[PDB]
């Protein structure tokens, strides 16, 4: 195992990660970030 700087939050009774990877990945590239999907109404 290795020590890694990463935030951990508590939701309900479960300890989960909370990652928002937009600077480590998808920064200064030519690809669009997912989770910005569209809807049709």
Partner 1 sequence: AIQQMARNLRTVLDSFERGTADQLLGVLLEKAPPLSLLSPINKFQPEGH
- Interacting residues toward partner 1 by CB under 8 A: 26, 28-33
| Polymer length of the chain | 41
Q: How far is the CB of 34 from partner 1 (least distance, A)?
A: 11
Q: How far is the CB of 15 from partner 1 (least distance, A)?
A: 31
**19 vs 33, which CB is nearer to partner 1?**
33
Name the nearest CA neighbour of 17 among 5, 28, 25: 5
Say which residues have a Cβ less than 8 Å from residue 17's Cβ, sequence separation at least 6: 6, 7, 8, 9
Q: How far is the CB of 20 from partner 1 (least distance, A)?
A: 14
């Amino acid at each position: 195992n290795a020590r890694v700087p990463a935030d951990l939050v508590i939701v309900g009774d479960k300890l989960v990660f909370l990652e928002a990877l937009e600077r480590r990945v998808y920064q200064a590239t030519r690809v669009a970030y997912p989770l910005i999907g569209n809807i049709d109404i």
